[PDB]
Structure 1
Amino acid sequence: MPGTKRFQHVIETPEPGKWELSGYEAAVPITEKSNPLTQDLDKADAENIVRLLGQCDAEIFQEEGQSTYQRLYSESILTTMVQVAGKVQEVLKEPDGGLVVLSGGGTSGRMAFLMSVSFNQLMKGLGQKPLYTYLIAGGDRSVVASREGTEDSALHGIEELKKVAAGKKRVIVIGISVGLSAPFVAGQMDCCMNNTAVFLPVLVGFNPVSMARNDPIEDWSSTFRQVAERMQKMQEKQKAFVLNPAIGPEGLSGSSRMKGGSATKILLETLLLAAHKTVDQGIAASQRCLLEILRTFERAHQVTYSQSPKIATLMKSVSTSLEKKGHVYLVGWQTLGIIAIMDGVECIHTFGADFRDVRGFLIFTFSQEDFLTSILPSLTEIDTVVFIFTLDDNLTEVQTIVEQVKEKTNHIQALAHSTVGQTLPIPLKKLFPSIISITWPLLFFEYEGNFIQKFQRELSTKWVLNTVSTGAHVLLGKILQNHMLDLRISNSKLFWRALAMLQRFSGQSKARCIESLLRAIHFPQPLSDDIRAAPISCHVQVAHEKEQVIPIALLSLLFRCSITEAQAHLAAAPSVCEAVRSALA
């Protein structure tokens, strides 16, 4: 019938009580699964939330059990890492016409960008000439914006890739998609396999290939699954690579910006650093070299979450300020500035949050006096301002700005990275009563800019920022069990996530859930055969512009009622959350 083929890959809702062993749940990709640790995240105080996410983050480093999925510390994965480091060496040896592209949509793209810069600096430091570049869905503007719709075109992907691979002669394309999902990457990987001479594809994500996305891409004939399967075949001949350890579901279901983003850094920084530091030593990269760095990244989680209690409190002061319709400012220097912006921008799509809700700032890019003149005026009793820096920063610039802000806020906290035995200038630097001091052992670096220290610090910040920003919103009651129900459908992935959530919460059939969703999306227009059969992009374009689409659809299902009737009920209730929560009972 009309719609059949578009919705073919979707599995029927299991019967009440038979979800567990169901065919359905066995095909939910790991990255979209509901994490058992956070079943009750929506009922947790600030300290539990920190504990729970610290724990979910910790799953990145958990080792493989004995009939089960490969993980970061499994020998197949490290062997692949070694192998790829090997292929990066080849390019470094011959840099003329050599290039290394890191590419991804959304947060995978944001992480691509950071890493491209770091390794460019590193070659700058050696006076070698940068070999890295990055690609993000929707162009460079996307690095610091909410642009979730840009990832759905394989041709776009390929076009960006063809622009940058100029007339290069050896190109490594590292396509990063946490879910093995994004059509942007899919096309790139497939294009690379059609020209093995020039290109070498390396696919990075966190699902097994048997769980790689398999629904049709609107502008492309093959699915991610197929592309990934074909890459894995080519890996036997060392002409493609798939790097895909499981790291367990996200604490907030499907919020791949979190564990997904971190594992991407951990994994790629490790590998590329090993490649660099081992070429100049005249020595192959080895499991043992990779391990040193993995274990360092693993210490960094421990180091970071030692500050849990303070972290729980910064959460409360962020949540509070937002509960009162305040704003929250994230002020950081160098790369940690960037990471702050990236965190705040992500709150827009992840939480329906306005750009002012949680905004990042780098000394978006406003200098000392510039920030003092324009932004300083707008602060208020109830706002929260967060400062983020190392002791190797310009701390005269830092202290200055804290000074002005203090008079206007009082809710100011900070996040300070130091090697042990650097001290906080002003013993009255107690403009921060009890800081989040993060103090790093001394490590035997040998490169100029101390790149392992950089990565530790970024990562630790990302965890803190992520845990804080996500935590604040959970406390505000905007999350359901461990799902963001009320999201904005702005790409096809998010459309599938919506549909899945309707099945899960209603317990009703595929067909009913599909019907309720499309009615919610296209109301006031009823379901035509055209509409039922439309490409998913057509539904996205309409949904992207509306509010409460998913809850309206869930209410229509639970009350077995019309869209007209469900909107009226929603408007009859004190809040979306309360309308839904009570409808679930």
Structure 2
Amino acid sequence: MPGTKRFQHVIETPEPGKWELSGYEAAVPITEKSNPLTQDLDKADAENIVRLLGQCDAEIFQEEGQSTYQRLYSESILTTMVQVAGKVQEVLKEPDGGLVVLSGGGTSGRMAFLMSVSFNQLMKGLGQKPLYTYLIAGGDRSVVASREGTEDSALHGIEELKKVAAGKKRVIVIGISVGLSAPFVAGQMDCCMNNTAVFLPVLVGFNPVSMARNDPIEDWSSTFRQVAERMQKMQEKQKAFVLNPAIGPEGLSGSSRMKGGSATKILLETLLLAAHKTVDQGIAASQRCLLEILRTFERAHQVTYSQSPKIATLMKSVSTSLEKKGHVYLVGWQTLGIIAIMDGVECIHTFGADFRDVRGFLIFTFSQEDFLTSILPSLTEIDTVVFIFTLDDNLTEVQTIVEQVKEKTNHIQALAHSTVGQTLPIPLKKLFPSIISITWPLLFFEYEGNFIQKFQRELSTKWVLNTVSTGAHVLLGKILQNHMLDLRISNSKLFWRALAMLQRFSGQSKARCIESLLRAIHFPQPLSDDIRAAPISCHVQVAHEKEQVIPIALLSLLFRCSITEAQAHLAAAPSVCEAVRSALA
């Protein structure tokens, strides 16, 4: 029948109680799993949210049990990180015709960009020509934009990679997809494998390959799973690498901007630093060099969440403000400015949030007096501003801008990074009551820019910001258990995540879930055989423009009713969350 093919790969809903025993749960990729630590995340108060998300983030450094999935500290992963450092070094010693590309979509794209800059800085500092570049689904504009639709074309990934690989002779492509999921990446990797004279593909993600996506890519013939299975075979002769440790599920299910973005930096910074440090010394990279850096990143988590109670309070001020239709501003310098901009933007697609609700500023790139005259006027008593800097920044810009903001608003707070025994100039000191200071012990550093100091702080800020943004919106009641129910379907992955959420919360069959989702999407047009048979992009393009697609589809199933009936029920309830909660009872 029509639609049987497009949905061939979908697993049937299990009958109640045999979720485990049907083998459906064992097929849910780790990156899409519900994290059991957060099954009651929607009931936690602010301090528990922080405690629960800090605990989920720490799963990154947790070791393998005794059967089970390799992890970051497993010897198969570290031995792969070594071999990859090894190949990065071959390129470092022959920079003529050599290039290192870091490519991802969404947050994997954002991460790739940061790291390409840093390692380019490092090489400038040594007087060598920069060898790093990034690639982000949707071009470079995507780095600071919410643009979830762009990851779905393989050809587009292959074009972008063909532009940048110019007339180079040895190219390392590090494709980053947390879920081993994005067709953008899949196409790059497959292309590298069709020309291993020039290309070396390295695939980075956090699912076992056996959970990689296996649904058809619209412009391509292989699935992500097949591409990855073929890379893994090539690794035996060291012509491709798959670097995929499990790091456990996300605190908010499928939200791979959190743990997944963090692990991506931890994993790649570690490995590239190791490679640079050890070329200088004319020594091969080794597990022991990687470990030093890895443990430093793991100290960084401890150091960061030891400041939890102040994180919980920044959380509340952020949540309070948005409950009143207020706005929230994130202001910081150099690379922490950017990380602020990334976090705010991600709130758009993650929570259905307006660009103004949580916006980030770099001193989007609005400098000292430009921000004073432009943004400063339009503030208000309920808003919130957050300053993010090190005590090595122009601390004179800092004090100024806060002084003016303290006039137009009082819900300020800040995030400050210091080496130990650095002190807060007394004007600045006095403007912040409960302040978030994070002091970093002395560490001896090989290079001029102190790149390891940079990485720790970027990462620690990421964790604080992500925990605040996510926590703030959970507090508002917009998350259901640990799922975001009311997402906007803007790509095929989210299409599937929606369908899985319908199977999970409805318990009804695969065919009914799918029918209800397509009706919801395409309403007011009815299911035709064309629509049943259409490629997933057709449903995505139409869902992307609508509101409450998933809750409307769920209600339809629970009440066993039409789309007309569920829509009017929804509009006759105080809110979405309210209506779904009641219906779930």
Report the TM range for the smaller structure's normalisation.
over 0.9
* Percent identical residues: 100
Query: In the TM superposition, what whole-angstrom CA distance separates every residue of 1:196-239 from its partner, at most 9, and x where no partner exists?
Result: 00000000000001111100000000000000000000000000
C-alpha contact (below 8 Å) 2:399/2:428 kept by paired residues: no
Q: Is the 8 A contact 2:399 2:427 kept in 1?
A: no
| Alignment match, 1:144 | 144
Partner Cα distance (2:274, 2:540) in 1: 42
Q: Quote how far apart the aligned CAs of 1:247 are.
A: 0.1
Q: Deviations over 1:296-325 (max 9, x none)?
A: 000000000000000000000000000000
Partner deviation per Cα, 1:482-541 (whole Å, 9 max, x = no partner):
000000000000000000000000010000000000000000000000000000000000
Once residues 489 and 378 of structure 2 are traced to their aligned partners in structure 1, the CA distance between those partners, rounded to angstroms, is: 32
1:22-72 deviations in Å (ceiling 9; x for gaps) = 311110000000000000000010000000000000000000001100000
Please give the secondary structure, in 2, of the residue aligned with 1:418.
strand
2:133 aligned with 1:161:
no
Give how far 1:194 is off. 0.1
* Secondary structure of residue in 1 paired with 2:242: strand
Structure 2 CA distance for aligned equivalents of residues 428 and 536 of structure 1: 54
Partner of 1:306: 306
| 2:133 is the counterpart of 1:133 | yes
**Counterpart-to-counterpart distance in 1, 2:380 and 2:40:** 34
CA distance in 1, matches of 2:393, 2:66: 47
Give 1:428 deviation, angstroms.
Answer: 6.0
Q: Which runs of 5+ in 1 are unaligned?
A: none
* Partner residue in 2 for 1:494: 494
- Offset of residue 18 of structure 1: 1.3
> Structure 2: how far apart are the matches of 1:425 and 1:169?
52
Distance (Å, rounded) in 1 between the aligned partners of 2:21 and 2:379: 53
Deviations 1:235-262 (A, max 9, x none): 0000000000000000000000000000
1:434 Cα deviation from its structure 2 partner: 1.2
Q: Which runs of 5+ in 2 are unaligned?
A: none
Deviation, structure 1 residue 402: 0.4
Q: Could you give the per-residue CA deviations for residues 151-209 of structure 1, whole angstroms, max 9, x where no partner exists?
A: 00000000000000000000000000000000000000000000000000000000001
Q: Report the counterpart of residue 244 of structure 1 in structure 2.
A: 244
SS at 1:387's partner residue?
Answer: strand
Deviation, structure 1 residue 21: 3.0
Local SS of the residue matching 2:134: strand
Q: Deviations over 1:392-422 (max 9, x none)?
A: 0000000000000011111000000000001
- Structure-2 separation of matches of 1:303 and 1:383: 29
Map Cα deviations across residues 542-584 of structure 1 (whole Å, 9 max, x no partner).
0000000000000000000000000000000000010000000
User: CA–CA distance in 2 between the matches of 1:428 and 1:127?
Assistant: 37
TM-score, length basis structure 2: 1.00
Q: Who is 1:170 aligned against?
A: 170
1:126 to 1:209, Cα distance in 2 relative to 1, 3 A: same
* CA–CA separation in structure 2 for the residues paired with 1:235 and 1:245: 16
TM-superposed deviation, 1:287: 0.2
Any runs of at least 4 consecutive aligned residues in structure 1 with deviations exceeding 3 A, and if so which? none
Separation of aligned partners in 2, 1:496 and 1:537: 12
Offset, 1:446:
1.5
Q: 1:331-350 counterparts in 2 under 5 A?
A: 331-350=331-350
**1:466-497 CA-partner distances (Å, limit 9, x unpaired):** 00000000000000000000000000000000
CA distance in 1, matches of 2:523, 2:428: 60
2:349 is aligned with 1:355: no
* Secondary structure of the structure 1 residue equivalent to 2:60: helix
Matched position secondary structure for 1:127? coil
Q: Equivalents in 2 of 1:47, 1:153: separation in Å? A: 41
CA RMSD of aligned residues (A): 0.5
1-structure distance, mates of 2:467, 2:42? 14
Q: TM-score, normalised by structure 1?
A: 1.00
Shift of 1:427: 6.0
User: Secondary structure, in 3 states, of the residue corresponding to 1:60?
Assistant: coil
- Take 2:412 and 2:7, find their aligned partners in 1: how far apart are those partners? 49
Count of matched residue positions in the alignment of Structure 1 and Structure 2: 585
Deviations 1:65-90 (A, max 9, x none): 01100000000000000000000000
Matches of 2:444 and 2:63, distance apart in 1: 26
Report the counterpart of residue 68 of structure 1 in structure 2. 68
Tell me, in whole angstroms, the C-alpha distance in 1 between the residues paired with 2:88 and 2:105: 23
Alpha-carbon distance in 1 for matches of 2:534, 2:461: 43
Tell me the CA shift for residue 366 of structure 1: 0.2
